[PDB]
């Protein structure tokens, strides 16, 4: 299968991603690595991932308005500078006490770092040296803000401590001008308003205006009381003279507030999910604001009663409860995750997410109707809801909701749907034992339930448990067709198959079984997993069934054979769930890890082996045609490709015999020796090494060495790996044959002696 791995762009350690003034380019960190994905309309690509150290974690990372360089801080007290153009770390240095806050100005020349201890050092972006070091206030530094003009003789740096103290350090003056402990809590966000007034975000709730000057005079112009934590704030030019400060809060409600009055012109959202926006990266000139949410998602909001997000990009899905395909197109896969919302992701680089949050419960189960549209959600919260699956437009609804029962909805399964697209009923179950079938309560099994699945005829249904039993009850009435006998220690999944007509069972031990309606008993028994099976997905061709497993590996087998066909080992630490594309077999694998992957069945690879097996049988008959009649150049090559030594040696027998009137063999054969590969000069000389052993195959070896020496550059022959050890065996046999041939010349002058004593007689 052509499995494609999927990874999360924003994950692990909390940090603020750095984006450039232009929409394109973005930086996110997952564990040790940092992933940079350029942002362009219609194209998403990841430039590169920095390996760094897997053991180390990333406290924070920063990108300049123009993305020339990427700056990140490791867990160890050192600073690593990365150059975007060459993808190489130009400089690295120790920042002593680690500083989470890094501030970059529009110009990339100056970068500010805040230590854990509260000591702040300013480092030039271009050269890895510290222009100056400030002892600063004796507290952790919450944030710093730089002020600059493309060309100016005045530069102002503002630093915010954990306590409500703001020091406006002046770089040219090298003095701390001002102290403003108006704030009673650490200042999380500082924004320097254009001329001079200083706006400081207050962690406690107070957002405080200030007057800044080179001279001592400074005063508090205004104080704004907002009912949210000020995570970050900024000044927006839009709205002219009445600039509306941009405020980010713990509740995640973005607020634009009049300057002249404390009233809020417009609030972009309130979100049902209980998340806080860690920090906001705003282009400002482009009037685009990026909000990093506490549910690990990024929302793009334009700046002009409720702010409307232009698009939503989800950096990482922490956990996928289950994988179920939804929609007519089938491009987007509905995601069941540990959150109180439903996320719809498109199927093919950052991926945008459609998100629906019908209930507060993290989704604990999910299901979609086979003919296209509907989606149904099972959650920890007792409420169970049905979702409107339109494929046309961006419209989505959740019209039906079900009161039911006082425990979490373990799983929602709908046997059937009517031809108008309305579900007939919902069977659903719990952490307790109270198992219910609501149309639009039964009990089964003393402990928590695990899975619910259905047959295309609505006749039969089955459900599974931790106390080891599977129950098959009538769908129409309130009747019990039977009970399955038991599995070894707890049944994680139950799956019906259309062609076979079987009920498969996954377990909490490493065994899978196949169960029958007719006898209520085990048809087949499987083994050779490590941990626990978790989910079993039906296969499109109804033969090659797919089981997942809580040891990170997925495996494929046929019920009729009973034997393992294939194993897939491409995921990291776990597996939880599995999806199959209905129309064409594509196995889609879902885990505790934030990686994801799409696999596919590939008869096509057999046709590669068919053409390879055909090619030999094709070329042997040419070879035996060449071995009939000559054309020994082609008889050499097809021997050299398919490695028949005795048929190759017969060519070099005949090639010497035909070469009886520097050219050592046939001339076109000599050109064929010149084009021999490095793997072929090993194999030819190795066969030539064998031929040098006995004196009958002797000279046929020696003429083949003479070509390779006469028709190659000999600097290759030392480069070639393992070729020297072949030369160790060739040489002392040649010296042995050298005396042996020369001694036949020494005996040969008896013929010279038989002339001289004879010609004297004459």
């Amino acid at each position: 299968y052509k499995g494609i791995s999927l990874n999360p762009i924003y994950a692990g350690s909390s940090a603020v991603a750095t984006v450039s003034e232009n929409g394109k380019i973005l930086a996110t960190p997952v564990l040790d690595e940092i992933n940079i994905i350029d942002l362009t309309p219609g194209s998403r690509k990841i430039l590169h991932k920095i390996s760094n150290e897997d053991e180390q974690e990333i406290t924070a990372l920063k990108l300049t308005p123009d993305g020339q360089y990427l700056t990140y801080v490791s867990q160890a007290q050192l600073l690593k500078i990365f150059h975007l153009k060459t993808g190489k770390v130009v400089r690295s240095m120790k920042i002593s006490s680690p500083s989470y806050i890094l501030d970059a100005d529009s110009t990339s020349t100056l970068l500010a770092v805040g230590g854990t201890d509260g000591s702040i050092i300013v480092v030039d972006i271009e050269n890895g040296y510290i222009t100056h070091s400030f002892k600063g206030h004796g507290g952790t530094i919450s944030s710093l803000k730089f002020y600059g003009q493309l060309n100016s003789k005045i530069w102002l740096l503002a630093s915010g401590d954990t306590n409500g103290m703001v020091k406006v350090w002046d770089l040219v003056k090298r003095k701390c001008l001002h102290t403003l402990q108006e704030h009673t809590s650490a200042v999380r966000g500082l924004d320097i308003i254009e001329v001079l007034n200083l706006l400081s975000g207050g962690r406690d709730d107070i957002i405080n205006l200030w007057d800044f000057n080179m001279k001592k005079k400074c005063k508090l112009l205004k104080t704004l009381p907002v009912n949210q934590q000020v995570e970050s704030c900024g000044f927006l030019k839009d709205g002219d003279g009445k600039r509306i400060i941009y405020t980010a809060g713990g509740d995640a409600i973005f607020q634009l507030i009049d300057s002249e009055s404390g009233s809020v012109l417009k609030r972009t959202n309130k979100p049902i999910e209980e998340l806080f926006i860690i920090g906001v990266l705003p282009i400002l000139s482009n009037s685009q604001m990026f909000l990093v949410l506490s549910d690990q998602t990024l929302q793009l909001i334009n700046v002009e009663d409720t702010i409307q997000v232009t698009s939503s990009i989800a950096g990482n899905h922490g956990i996928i409860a289950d994988m179920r395909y939804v929609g007519p197109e089938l491009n987007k896969l509905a995601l069941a995750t540990n959150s109180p919302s439903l996320r719809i992701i498109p199927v093919p680089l950052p991926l945008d997410v459609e998100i629906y949050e019908g209930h507060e419960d993290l989704l604990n189960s999910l299901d979609a109707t086979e003919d296209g549209l509907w989606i149904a959600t099972a959650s920890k919260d007792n409420t169970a809801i049905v979702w409107r699956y339109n494929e046309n437009s961006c419209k989505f609804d959740i019209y039906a909701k079900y009161i039911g029962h006082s425990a979490a909805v373990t799983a929602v399964g709908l046997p059937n749907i009517v031809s108008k697209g309305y579900p007939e009923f919902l069977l659903t179950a719990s952490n307790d034992l109270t198992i219910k079938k609501w149309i639009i309560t039964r009990h089964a099994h003393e402990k928590d339930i695990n899975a619910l699945s259905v047959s295309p005829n609505d006749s039969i249904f089955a459900t599974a448990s931790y106390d080891k039993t599977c129950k098959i009850w009538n769908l129409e009435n309130g009747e019990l067709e039977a009970t399955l006998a038991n599995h070894k220690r707890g049944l994680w999944d139950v799956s019906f198959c259309q062609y076979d007509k079987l009920l498969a069972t996954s377990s909490g031990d490493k065994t899978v079984k196949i169960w029958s309606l007719d006898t209520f008993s085990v048809m087949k028994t499987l083994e050779g997993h490590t941990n626990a099976v978790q989910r079993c997905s039906f296969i499109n061709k109804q033969k090659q069934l797919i089981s997942c497993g809580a040891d990170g590996l997925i495996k494929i087998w046929d019920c009729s054979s009973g034997e393992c066909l294939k194993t897939l080992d491409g995921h990291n630490n776990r597996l939880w769930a599995l999806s199959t594309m209905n129309d064409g077999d594509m196995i889609v694998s879902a885990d505790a890890d934030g990686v994801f992957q799409f696999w596919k069945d590939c008869e096509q690879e057999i046709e590669e082996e068919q053409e390879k097996a055909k090619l030999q049988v094709e070329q042997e008959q040419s070879l035996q045609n060449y071995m009939s009649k000559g054309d020994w150049t082609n008889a050499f090559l097809l021997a050299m490709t398919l490695d028949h030594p005795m048929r190759l040696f017969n060519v070099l027998k005949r090639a010497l015999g035909e070469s009886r009137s520097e050219v050592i063999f046939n001339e076109e054969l000599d050109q064929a020796i010149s084009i021999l590969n490095d793997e072929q000069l090993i194999l030819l000389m190795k066969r030539c090494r064998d031929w040098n052993t006995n004196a009958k195959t002797h000279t046929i070896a020696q003429r083949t060495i003479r070509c390779i020496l006469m028709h190659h550059n000999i600097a290759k022959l030392s480069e070639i790996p393992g070729m020297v050890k072949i030369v160790d065996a060739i040489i002392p046999y040649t010296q042995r044959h050298f005396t042996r041939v020369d001694n036949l010349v020494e005996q040969s002058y008896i013929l010279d002696y038989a002339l001289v004593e004879m010609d004297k007689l004459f």
Partner: protein, 49 residues
């Protein structure tokens, strides 16, 4: 000592001027190698047989 050197700088016209002047001289002194084998092969044939 220098067979590494004169091999890599083979077919220089200055070195091979000397080496052809070597081989034009060195060919004449095969006449003992054609003399020893007669001196060997007879004396082995005479004393044994």
């Amino acid at each position: 000592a220098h067979g590494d050197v004169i091999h890599a700088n083979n077919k220089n016209q200055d070195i091979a001027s000397a080496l052809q002047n070597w081989e034009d001289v060195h060919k004449k002194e095969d006449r003992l190698d054609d003399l020893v084998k007669f001196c060997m092969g007879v004396a082995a044939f005479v004393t044994t047989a």
